[PDB]
């Protein structure tokens, strides 16, 4: 879609809009199972060697489940427990008879829904029947001939089928029974798509999930659960996207300082509310660590667990940081160091002191030299930006940028009553302290 | 065991107790080795192809060792060097004759203790003898028949044996010779258990380590060391648990704010001493980043390298934050944003402003609507908590919660002399500033 | 080379010098390709089974590219976009005919340079020709005999060749098309070395990169790009080391507090400018998160994207923190907790309160007991340091340490006007506040 950007010279910040939301709001828990089997010449020795790998993988996973499974403004977030729902389901599976309900449900099929004893309705999947393979092809060789008649084409095939159990067990072993993202050994591409289609969700969610399998995997958990009655079962916890196609925008901020000659006499100010914003249910979901969100074209995948829910008036800070309805968050300092923030469609440059700051093009080199202050350049005709010894490549996606001129608000502050070293502050709090200092003077 | 929780309404915090400690206090360094060998039709070409994979894995690891191997209150921690002990041992192995001492010690066995030249006594393990396999089965095929007589069952078997060397080399290649956790290619489940049993430790440590192999792996390092005289050797650095079965408890904290109508007029306070606490040697080991500790049932595995050693009186902050023996750490602000902290046995809810905050059950939906302030609900009968647009699942483990009523201490502060934006502060420091402001007035 | 260390008792800090730089300053983008092919008894069924794995890997990667690819003083850094350059190249490859230019260029060879339509000159590599293998050996079996004549030695060989495609696809599936470090499936050791040799760089850069392949891998990206016209192509983004062999030094800092008896009456100060420093182009490249830099012997690999460019006078803070040319950064507090910082050649110990702080040797145990204050011990004759319940191993590399005596500067401050809880501050700012407090008194 249309991605557009606006740079606010007055506050050294830029907003990228045109994105659409896909917010993980909930969890779907599915129970994936693998049916187990309970149990010389060159080719048989390889079968016994592979069968040993199988026996020890089972013993390994049994040992691993002795315990129940577990695992600027970011400091404002709450603290969730990401696998609480999957662990709850996995707890129900240890209740007696519960494992047998699943074993029975998938006797004649590989996909089935099971209502568990506490009422939970979960999709169930038998992805590998080692029970049947071992019990139909390897058992005859090991007992009827007394380890005599065998062919190497079954050795090859057994290694293939056993490999996935060996890899699932490897992942759980280096991860204490909880893995994320969910690999293709836990759930192949075909199985996951099939799982998504049989999921009880909207057609929009199914299309969205199927066209972004790779993101679904990164937002999912595999929780190793139980081995009981020749059934190996792990819970796969999949994201529920309850907010889809609402507007999102990305706020980029950079330090705004005065540019006086005498070093140390300068005051700085930085908008601290940078991160991803998405309209959500009459409020705005604010993600202060924009690295928690994944962007695919103009779709942005975030997790509400790493969000604050803010009044929509928080948007007014971009056009009017002095607006009377939301108290815009800033931090203050006297550290006027140079840096750049690469935005979606351009680059913000905070250039101070003796720093060389330029913007270049691929074939012609330097096309703009920044003066001291906070400035911006759009990615049209620019390929790189240089601040000091640091070269930044700019994003080269299509979209129009608008440069909104305005006097930098740092000019409105008297440096001799300016409160420096304020981090979790706001426009009004800074004024509150300035008036108190001006009172005592 | 018995997990229990107490919520302190006065300070918006909760303590989970009943846990027992397993603290990594030291390191055991073992030297794992792989003995190397020094060195047409369809089946021989595959042997030569696999032999090439072997030769290049050796060349790769030789190239990789040109250099010596290397790798709220968290800011208070010191700075260790995690693989210093393994690197020290690995340095000793480059001394002349040192590699030959090991090669000799494991001539007749695969497990042996070797006292190295500087006095260090290390367990040694030969986990794969490629020297013997290549030198007994592949060498005859490549020289005696001139690449003639071969059978595919050896091609299969060679790929199996060579695979682990290829994978060990892959791990070291993407990790610059230092890996953690220690995979099952570095050390299989059988080898690690055997290593633990032959370790010079208590019977309690052996049982504890064997029943938590997956945690031992996550707290271990594999340091690629030396290739010399047909011997490949890497050091595996294993945790020493010198503190076991002492009481541990988890402190959860959340922001406590006043709830006045006029927005911006509110003051907030948050206990900053959240994290894991374990009794340790007459003091308390405090782990400010509770994500450094791993919980398995009621056992909690932590690393003393990420701890502060505090006076045990730090515990008094939970029952009496104004106690005269320890100066309880807090932070102050005026940012009254809503959030929840999911505890071990319930959920703390900091609900402010216009936020919808509720607690729900699986089948009946909303059972409690929180008013503004800091409140708590136990996981008995509750499955989810909702703060704004964020849905939290609560932990569903058994254990009793006690709600300790008390007036929120934020009510005891006059907002017009309240010092906001204090981060590394304490009860006494805040009083010190309030009295100084009250003096100048 | 010569690694040396100096400890400044006056400021509780230590500098390690003698290192030489290797700074990633730019990016080289190469286009790696795999040529694809467009498409019963026991041995044929395995071929059809492996061929299915191939078809689905292709379908998987096609689904994955529906979207364009994306991915104390650290807070002062700017914000780059690491794969912007590779993504830009990958965008050019979707232009029509562009894929065919590459397909043509590597018809007769596997390595070739191609000037793309926008002028970019990129190295191109065909690392696997599955097109030819499938189209010469498997096609005859599946069509001419009608799935009759086949031998197991080709089944083995097909699994080998197809395996790398299956693994590349696995990596991209768990990583949303962008991986780092660059595995040996993306680019084998031989291919990467060959790529480095054909790179348009200096002989120094080629030697440096070839002798540190493992670091090059960790600083590289694999960006999954396009599948078009039987050509699979991903961009490998390799580091350009434009700064080599300049001096580097590592600054370690630890809290310096007064040691009065009455607890709570103490004031602390910590130099905040700790991290890696490298001379670079007349300025100094400062890396505040020293964990972004990788050290190999005396060579230190850093990324300028995680640096500030500072005046070289920042070095004066080590010999004279009160120097008049650079305003040295510090933080203040009243939290006198004990801890240690393990340096390159010794250990800084900040010992306060009732903490037991000692230094030990391997065979003789405790050789020094620290008194309260900030002290230092060199790694000559010392193996471990203990602060409270935390045991630290010291680095055991050769190099001389010098202990520079001096009165701790915290003694020069009157505790009753000392501004505590200052984080982004400096020597002059603290004096500025002290004089303002002394004025109002
Ligand atoms: C991107 S950052 O959050 O990591 C950098 C913050 C560091 N910092 C501090 C100290 N401080 C923290 O470290 N936290 C974080 C971990 C809980 C705070 C939360 C609330 N108030 C102060 C906090 C003061 C200060 C003043 N100016 C600039 C930076 C400053
Ligand atoms: Cl870049
Ligand atoms: Cl949750
Ligand atoms: Cl250590």
TrEMBL record, chains A, B, C:
Glycosylation sites: 435
Subcellular location: Host Golgi apparatus membrane; Host cell membrane; Virion membrane
Subunit structure: Homotrimer. Heterodimer with fusion protein F2; disulfide-linked. Interacts with host NCL; this interaction plays a role in viral entry into the host cell. As a heterodimer with F2, interacts with host heparan sulfate. As a heterodimer with F2, interacts with host IGF1R; this interaction activates PRKCZ/PKCzeta that recruits NCL/nucleolin from the host nucleus to the plasma membrane. Part of a complex composed of F1, F2 and G glycoproteins. As a heterodimer with F2, interacts with host RHOA; this interaction facilitates virus-induced syncytium formation. Homotrimer. Heterodimer with fusion protein F1; disulfide-linked. As a heterodimer with F1, interacts with host heparan sulfate. As a heterodimer with F1, interacts with host IGF1R; this interaction activates PRKCZ/PKCzeta that recruits NCL/nucleolin from the host nucleus to the plasma membrane. Part of a complex composed of F1, F2 and G glycoproteins. As a heterodimer with F1, interacts with host RHOA; this interaction facilitates virus-induced syncytium formation.
The keyword Coiled coil appears for this protein: yes
Disulfide bonds: 12-374, 248-278, 257-268, 293-302, 317-328, 351-357
Cellular component aspect of the GO annotation: host cell Golgi membrane; host cell plasma membrane; viral envelope; virion membrane
GO biological process terms held by the UniProt record: entry receptor-mediated virion attachment to host cell; fusion of virus membrane with host plasma membrane; symbiont entry into host cell; symbiont-mediated induction of syncytium formation
Major location category of this protein: host cell
Keywords: Cleavage on pair of basic residues, Coiled coil, Disulfide bond, Fusion of virus membrane with host cell membrane, Fusion of virus membrane with host membrane, Glycoprotein, Host cell membrane, Host Golgi apparatus, Host membrane, Host-virus interaction, Lipoprotein, Membrane, Palmitate, Signal, Syncytium formation induced by viral infection, Transmembrane, Transmembrane helix, Viral attachment to host cell, Viral attachment to host entry receptor, Viral envelope protein, Viral penetration into host cytoplasm, Virion, Virus entry into host cell
Similarity annotation: Belongs to the paramyxoviruses fusion glycoprotein family.
Coiled coil: none
Domain of life: Viruses
Positions spanned in the full protein: 26 to 506 of 574
Membrane topology term: Single-pass membrane protein; Single-pass type I membrane protein
Protein name: Fusion glycoprotein F0
Task of the protein: Inactive precursor that is cleaved at two sites by a furin-like protease to give rise to the mature F1 and F2 fusion glycoproteins. Major determinant of the species specificity of RSV infection. The trimer of F1-F2 (F protein) also facilitates the attachment to host cell by binding to host heparan sulfate. F protein is involved in the entry into the host cell through the interaction with host IGF1R. This interaction activates PRKCZ/PKCzeta that recruits host NCL/nucleolin to the apical cell surface where it can bind fusion glycoprotein F1.
